[PDB]
UniProtKB/Swiss-Prot annotation, chains A, B, C, D, E:
Temperature dependence: Optimum temperature is 75 degrees Celsius. Thermostable.
Catalytic center residues: K101
Enzyme class: oxidoreductase
Name of protein: Glutamate dehydrogenase
InterPro entries named among the record's database cross-references: Aminoacid_DH-like_N_sf, GLPV_dehydrogenases, Glu/Leu/Phe/Val/Trp_DH, Glu/Leu/Phe/Val/Trp_DH_C, Glu/Leu/Phe/Val/Trp_DH_dimer, Glu/Leu/Phe/Val_DH_AS, Glu_DH, NAD(P)-bd_dom_sf
Subunit text: Homohexamer.
GO terms, molecular function: glutamate dehydrogenase (NAD+) activity; glutamate dehydrogenase (NADP+) activity
Organism in which the protein naturally occurs: Thermotoga maritima (strain ATCC 43589 / DSM 3109 / JCM 10099 / NBRC 100826 / MSB8)
Gene label: gdhA
Length: 409, 409, 409, 409, 409
């Protein structure tokens, strides 16, 4: 099971540290799981019932935090697993949040804008019993955006009897959102890619970088790394193929091109290469911001990158991990790498509490500041246990979450 | 699955009546399902995590009502199914309640009174988010009693910040309980047994009755039938064997004996017979207040009883149903027959709401009055559809629950 | 200390029964004590601070119940003791209430109607934090009436944001009050005096009665006993002197006279006698509805009354108790005797809860019904312990309050 | 009485300023006093009742703020007096808080960690009725720490139904605490010591300092004074004796030693001297961070210190005050001097409200900034009335507290 | 009607931009209108009923914000219109507030301080149902001040059961107020006057300014412009007449004089002129901070001012607008010009939320900062539509309020 697998990874780091048996058990199982079957009236007049989920794994460190998904293939198991991760993700970044997640078994593409909105309100009205700005703060995920989030916010406000705007994050800027929300993730990767260069002594100005994928993370990661770090992005890939260039692409131009044309492929001044090839490129840093298992057994042994900054989720398989560590290649854990998003969502929730909003620069600095600490904090634990950075990040999380529970009773 | 099975039985009656497809769907799936993993400190100092469930199927007719179970073998499925039934059970009785159930996977026998109390409070503290005197009113079930229920009530009160005593039913008398709580179920069977007699034209004074089982239900049902109806209980059985006597036993003496001696067997002035034999006895009314499937294919064809008042749960299998209906034997549905319990629980919740308590006679009259109506109401439906009384009871319920949902939107 | 003294009386009965040491300690100490110093603006413009008290002794059996006093000589000790009693008083009557009391050190006579109202609101606004219809329901006492009580009611309602009228009892009839409120106490004495006659086998029609005092209690007690019991009230006394007549006075005429003339003395057809004489009168029942210690050491040995129904508070001293018990004279405990008042106040709180009001007859029957049970219940305890009826009522109370606490945890 | 004595000091300053009589009276008496008797289940199974207190003197300027004590010798009087002080302490610092205090009559040393926690939760559960993040914010005091405080916080959160973490201050850092909490008090004394020097024209670089006592206050006061002010700490004392050195100790080394060895005595390179001697030392600044009455009649006449910064509570007696003022020695009032603690507690409560936390530097600057103003503000008043700085601080407090009440009504 | 007129102005801008018809309708009509008739006890004992209003036009962007008026001539129409404006005022400043207004038909001058306070509490206690720190935050207006505002704050807090101080703005500094509150408006005008000089290329050092009126706005506006901008205030006027001087008055001296003497008239070193003359003065900037319609048809054609900064409300009539625009004279809209007040009130509500207060400089910079943006934002819209700046400000407002509602659903 997807959840059990998540648990396994947890036990690994749990055995590395002296964690009380009886205690570890609570840190394993989730606090709350609420399943709802809510009816939504469709345009054609007939009613249709949908299944919804919302799980709060841990709340020891603070109010549960986690996105909501709208997908035809969503299992309580997948939800639990994700929330389970949220707990460690939030903790590694040192934010006063917990672990939560939720979703609805539904294919948005088959629903009308109106139907969608209705379903959204009803769902949020159903899980309202468990959420709260000081209990559970939902946010966007797969197939959900500022628009849907906005409905959530509005619904709660009208339900509670007053404007809240802090019940959900990822809201539109002129409605309680936070500037820098888009570049959040990317900047996080950039900060990490820079520190990774530091620990390895690689000068950024000369450093070469390859980025697998060109979605939100890839684009921003690549662009920022290029402008702010001076590193030469010698290759990027699309959900089609990839282009190479030892001279270094112009991330800006590349973006525009990928906006005017479905893919970055065909782009002139770029040697067409397969996605697998890009991963095997001879570059200083590999930023896998695409699909999972990207780096697996087969690749692992051939990867020449000195450091890997995980822009996506689980790009590298556990087998690759072992091999990469063995080979001495630095693998920065995703929980830390793309935590930027969650990090900026926290700032939004803060700005919302006091109803005062910070300017771009502020959010940027704050995000960068916390990112650096999180990194260094993981490194410390890394050296103290002489283990895989990912493992380090996991211990640090588990530890912090335990101290809280312990001190609470 | 136990739940799917429950669903099947529901569809049977749903097909007999013109029930909107899209509507039926909502009447099938449960509204809320909350799963909790709560830690409980054991006497020996170490902590142990327990799994708990609470499901609110439907709340259309009123606040969800259902008991809580403490059993090492408890599945969400079993809970859902039970809750599903509650919805129709309350419905048929015309009580302003909904459908709910809950439990905790634990063996009370391995826990210390203290540990038990603690687990009890924690559990109730965890599902508190969903309960309420006007939302969900839990009650005792398997391995839970007035003592446990009392804890729940106290916990909520101290949690909410004021004495409630209506958050749970089945509380001890001198603490918000209701008189007649014990004989509740039995009296219900008695009222039913009487009406069964009326429709068949059988004079109670001369009527003969056999009761399979001598638990709370059996004893009280037998005792009351004997004293209030004048019918001669020619046979009763223990979880060992049964005793016969055409002269009619002295229910009172029989009880005392079953109290001083594990079983009613050995009791002088009684012809020892097997449980299976009792069922085949030539009596006017058969009251199976024992185990499920008691009356099945094999027995069915041989049962001489003119009427069967199901004091227990599902004593007769569906196959038995078909054959008994075919043979023209009246089988009073348990949902209606043993509802007496739930019915008296409602009165306690009422008394609790106004903090005023009625005396025995009151409860008795009230219980009997409503029981009568419920019976006659099912009969009307029976004749309108020319179906099995059990089925009639099911339609009556589904109908009542639909009207509410329909009129609500 | 007045409190310690009350405590002593409690330990007496506590030793008579097997009461857990550690448990008895909680039933001794009061749960809450709130002392307030609130400023009240006086007519002349200057502010004056007043001291207020509100104590909730026990809440185990239900919400705390107790009156408020306006007296220049009020000590937290006096308040505590009174509240302490309330807990046993309500419990002996079997009412779902607790124990509470309060007061304000102030002399109403020196305050203008306005000033008084203002102080009243401010006070109730201050102890509001601890009161509530399901927490603490204040009532009138010394120097407070329906008029003051109404203010309280209005204040809370306007504070809480909606009409309550169940926050306090003893409210004016056309404002949430209950019929029978005045004759409450008296009717209680009446019921008691009747049962006292029954246990002694004395026929009411021929029985003679003497009543020391002619206040609310005395009058009503006398009148109803006369009319409903047929007993001949051969003597009554004023806060001046008393009149005798073996023929039996006309309670109604006597009342009218005491209304047109300060005292019942001077009344024609009545042999003037001192208050002390009345107590030594040769009558079947003595109803001391006047001052405390009325019956003491000196008198005790000379009292010819076969039964004493304490209409007032502590008319008989402990010394007299011993002597009277020794002599075999039945002394009905005031906590049970004049509980009628608190009993009717409960009904008011009940009527208030459901916003429906009963008619006189109803209240009357209810009050008499409960009164009878209360009496019989104490008698049972009396025979079980072979002690003084007052002691019996004390145990009965302590027991009931213990069971609740025990069962709650 | 301890309280009456506190009032006396108040009246002194109240007479120096034109303060409305009737108004003064309300500023004297405390608003709320809650006394609780709560049972705690002991490990051995038996129940034990403990007494608790919670007093909210004034709330005019904001929510009541004050610590809780666990001491076998605690009187309502001691608590009242303490809260009475808080009122003026908070006021002089210009913080939006009120005055409150509380404690439990119990000896922690005789209770097991478990028993202690239990007693802690129950107590907080009992006084919960009066507290709140916007009503009363408790904090640690004698025999209570971040560990206990954490329990309170957790208890409230689980009681209120959501994480609060602002109901109490002094929480552990990774749980809502604030950096700089420890050095708080000391830094305050440091800030004061500096300004005292400034008013006297004494250059800090050359100034000499002596600190009686080496607890939290003493240590940090000394260390920071040394490092940040450059002043030479020529002497410090333990709860045993004291050491001198015109060369100036190495506060850091001194601390370590006091950590490895019970006392700072025996420490090499230090002339052993009695505590009384230290006080008579010929130094520029005397920082009595030990016990009360340290400086009294006898000493007063002999003290050569040019300025005294009261790190402890009431180190100087009134008699000493008179003589010291007479001699022209500057005595900085404790309410102002050791207010640093309360000051940082405010910052924590602020950080809690917006759930955003400041870094050390911020807290430091903030504390120092407010400390300075508070000082200067008292000085102004001092010159306007030409009185003792302590008196000035008292007037400034009473005034600020009066303005609020006046403008409020 | 006054309201209809306001609506007209709105339709003007609504026609300029593509605003959905059905949508515009919601933006036209107000969400809530609460009319109250509350009795107030007068000093002479008799009761008097007063009429009160509170209207919340729109709440899309945030909680409704608007002052309260105490005037014998106040119509629901006047109130609605005003609230209607607030919605656009707040919006153009980009503050997270809505639109609200209220008042009481009463002449303060005929009421005693006591009576006025009472009336104030009663009114706020009556409209309490609709207000809230996150619903509706009242503020001072005509005939209401910090003193009255304070009463509201106190009343709500004692009503809600805890200090709020964020329920209303414009509170006294030492009670939740914000520094810079007085100079707020004026500073806004100053900022505006400066930017106006910028767009016109007029150097402030040489620029000449005339200010019609010498109230809060006029004084501060003139003073700050003089000192911070260096512009020479060549003329100011009283509610009597005005004085001129090409040399430039000494605003400070001028204020003192207007304080010592009813008017600025008679002031030596000033050429006495009529109010109408001042408007026709040949200066670079005209700051009409006096009465409405000050600049009308007649004047319009004669005004030589290059730019007009509307310090007051509607000083220029629509007819004047047309002519001024035609003539090419810049007219900065009051909604933007004197929004400084509303702007500073928001900062107060912010500081109140976190209970932390900023210092003067902070507020100053914050106010000037947002003022600048607001201006520039309007200018952008101005060029995009090539319309009158006032119109521009209106569109920008309507737009922002639309997006909110649109995105909310």
């Amino acid at each position: 099971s997807l959840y059990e697998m998540a648990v396994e990874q947890f036990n690994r780091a749990a055995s590395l540290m002296d964690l009380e048996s009886d205690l570890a058990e609570v840190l394993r199982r989730p606090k709350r799981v609420l399943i709802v079957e809510f009816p939504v009236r469709m345009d054609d007049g007939h009613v249709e019932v949908f299944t919804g989920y919302r799980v709060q794994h841990n709340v020891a460190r603070g109010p549960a935090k986690g996105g909501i998904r709208y997908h035809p293939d969503v299992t309580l198991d997948e939800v639990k697993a994700l929330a389970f991760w949220m707990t460690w993700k939030t903790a590694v970044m040192d934010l006063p949040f917990g672990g939560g997640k939720g979703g609805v078994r539904v294919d948005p593409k088959k629903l009308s804008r109106n139907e969608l909105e209705r379903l959204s309100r009803r769902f949020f009205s159903e899980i309202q019993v468990i959420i709260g700005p000081y209990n559970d703060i939902p946010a966007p995920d797969v197939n959900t955006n500022a628009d849907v989030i906005a409905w959530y916010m509005d619904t709660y406000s009208m339900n509670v009897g007053h404007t809240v705007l802090g019940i959900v994050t990822g809201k539109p800027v002129e409605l309680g959102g936070s500037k820098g929300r888009e570049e959040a993730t990317g900047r996080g990767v950039k900060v990490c890619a820079g520190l990774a260069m530091d620990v390895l002594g690689i000068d950024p100005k000369k450093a070469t970088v390859a980025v697998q994928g060109f979605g939100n993370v890839g684009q921003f990661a690549a662009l920022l790394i290029s402008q702010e770090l001076g590193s030469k992005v010698v290759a990027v890939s699309d959900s089609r193929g990839g282009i190479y260039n030892p001279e270094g692409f112009d991330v800006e131009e590349l973006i525009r091109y990928k906006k005017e044309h479905g893919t970055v492929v065909t782009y002139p001044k770029g040697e067409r290469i397969t996605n697998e090839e890009l991963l095997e490129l001879d570059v200083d840093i590999l930023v896998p911001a695409a699909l999972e298992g990207a780096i697996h057994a087969g690749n692992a042994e051939r990867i020449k990158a000195k450091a890997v900054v995980e822009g996506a989720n689980g790009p590298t398989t556990p087998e690759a991990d072992e091999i990469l560590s063995r080979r001495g290649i630095l693998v920065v854990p995703d929980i830390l790498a793309n935590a930027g998003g969650v990090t900026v969502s926290y700032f939004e929730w803060v700005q919302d509490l006091q109803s005062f909003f910070w300017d771009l620069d502020q959010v940027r600095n704050a995000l960068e500041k916390m990112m650096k600490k999180a990194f260094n904090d993981v490194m410390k634990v890394k050296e103290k246990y002489n283990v895989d950075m990912r493992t380090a990040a996991y211990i640090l999380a588990i530890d912090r979450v335990a101290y809280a529970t312990k001190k609470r009773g």
